[PDB]
Symmetry: C2
Subunit: 358 residues, 2 copies
């Protein structure tokens, strides 16, 4: 890599790893639209397996960006509309509190306080229907943003219903394959198991536990190379050949709601560039990022703004991930670690690097 | 033309011209992405000049499609947002009724009953400010649609303000030029006058009169060839190289409001295809309640996308179906009834679909 990139990355991520006791880390920096790769430590400590360009990490909530784009793609295909009632695509969801809750609300966490997690006890298809049928909103639809796996999770599940594909097949054939993300998986196949990093929590090797809607909200695993390609694709959608996927990526960066200085896209969250770093760093703290916030509708949504900081934090029990990019500058970063460490540390490190190269 | 195209066109247009006493007409059919041209009669009866594929016709309200796309292009450039208050681009507009009226409202005739025409008295920029300042809405913004030149016209004027360009220079540089519409004019140059058809109203030769906002709402003139290119660009926006223009076209065909079976875009109006011909087939003022499409539906390829247009002496129509790669332009120098245009267009496109 050019010396300026090596310099800032080494000065920033290397000490971060030391400070946070991260066993293994892969970083990609996209600079002038080209990817550069950096690796530290071990994917599996016991086996002394190094992190490589082939190592799969749990993306955790970064998976919501895939779900948003896939939803975007279904919109572009004319299969769904964000303006449609949730019930249009789940006619079994008949309970009265669902009147007026649309796919937009589900996708953008604005349905009225759907919970952060689907409860652990919810397993089966029947458990899930029961859960949503009994759920009572804290607020009217389209008034408050409460970040929620149960919200975007349901969006993903419903977005694929008209296609008649499973969520996994739709994701693979409409998003992963066209973008040649060949080592990106919702379900890691046996052939990839040797490349699947262990996460570490309290010193113990762990993988994400299965859960209802996992695939839609937090279940994707990917390598630093595929994630760099994911950044390139989101940086430059209009270079994608599949017309609906091109549009889908664009739609996921539309600004639907504003709270403070942030705007909610589909999976992606965005701020105007230049940003105040303290705003994204402080705002990434879960005490803020997971709290209810009043939203103002953007009526109608603002199309993808090139001069934006576009980003998403992701974690599982044993992993912490971050993706940030600025379309105007052709500049991006991906940070994948097999320890879950605090969000502001990730955002601060990413800011230092991108601000240095911008 | 392939005989089948030749045959539906001739069998439909011949009786139309006969029944409506149209002096001159040009039609283009876009069929699987290739244009086919037909011409009949006189551009100028007195001078016995025929309609040709180079004849300029007044598009009338079809001009709003250009304005809608140019707006869309300005949104894509991040110069404007449809959610912006009108006063963001015209701070001089201080009267209180303008609170809550956005560029979306102006673009989609939902501002609360702006009038169909700007009064003839209104000419200067100070006249225009006074007009909009004095205007009293009958309705709250975003509740009813009333088709209005004063609404989309102002939208057009404001949308180009951040660019620094005049409306005409923005239209030329950002829409006409990139799409190779090289015989499409807001102001017909003297060199091109030999091609400019006369319109006919009660048998008298007429051209459209100057008015405030004419350029934005009804003032474009074009050839059947340029209009076929316009249709092709709108049939296939993601084929256009200039990214903001492609986006702008796409945004102009988004569905913002619903009234009955019709959806309002920016300039363009759309119905779901297959469309009941009766749901498409004059009334001086038609106020209708609108349902917001929240958030707007991106351009649906399975649509009948259309716009009628009239001046005192001209009647135009454009309709296309993106999913079928099919379209039609009908340009005539008589303002004849809208339902006759739509029927003819539907007969032709249904036969080819």
């Amino acid at each position: 890599a050019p010396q300026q990139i090596n310099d800032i990355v080494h000065r920033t991520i290397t000490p971060l790893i030391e400070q946070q006791k991260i066993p293994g880390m892969a970083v990609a920096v996209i600079y002038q639209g080209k990817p550069y790769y950096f690796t530290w430590g071990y994917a599996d400590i016991a086996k002394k397996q190094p992190v490589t360009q082939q190592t799969l990490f749990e993306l955790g909530s970064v998976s919501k960006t895939f779900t948003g784009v896939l939803g975007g793609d279904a919109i572009a295909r004319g299969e769904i509309k964000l303006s449609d009632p949730t019930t249009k695509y789940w006619p079994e969801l008949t309970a009265k509190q669902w009147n007026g809750i649309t796919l937009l609300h589900l996708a953008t966490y604005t349905a009225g306080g759907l919970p952060l997690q689907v409860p652990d006890e919810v397993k089966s298809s029947s458990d899930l229907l029961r859960f949503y049928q009994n759920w009572q909103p804290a607020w009217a639809p389209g008034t408050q943003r409460l970040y929620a796996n149960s919200s975007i999770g349901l969006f993903g599940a419903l977005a694929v219903k008209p296609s008649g594909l499973s969520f996994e097949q739709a994701m693979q054939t409409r998003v992963f394959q066209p973008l040649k993300l060949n080592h990106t998986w919702i379900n890691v196949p046996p052939a990839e198991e040797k490349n699947y990093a262990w996460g570490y929590r309290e010193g113990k090797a762990v993988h994400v536990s299965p859960g209802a809607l996992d695939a839609k909200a937090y279940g994707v695993k990917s390598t630093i190379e595929d994630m760099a390609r994911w950044v390139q694709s989101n940086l430059k959608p209009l270079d994608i050949n599949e017309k609906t996927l091109q549009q889908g990526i664009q739609l996921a960066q539309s600004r639907y709601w504003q709270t403070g200085d942030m705007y909610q896209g589909l999976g992606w969250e965005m701020l105007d560039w230049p940003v105040n770093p303290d705003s994204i760093i402080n705002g990434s703290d879960n005490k803020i990022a997971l709290a209810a916030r009043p939203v103002k509708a953007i009526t109608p949504p603002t199309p993808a703004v090139r001069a934006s900081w576009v980003h998403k934090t992701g974690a599982t029990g044993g992993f912490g991930s971050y993706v940030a990019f600025i379309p105007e500058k052709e500049l991006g970063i991906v940070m994948l670690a097999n320890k879950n460490y605090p969000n502001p540390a990730r955002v601060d490190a990413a800011w230092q690097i991108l601000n240095a190269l911008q």
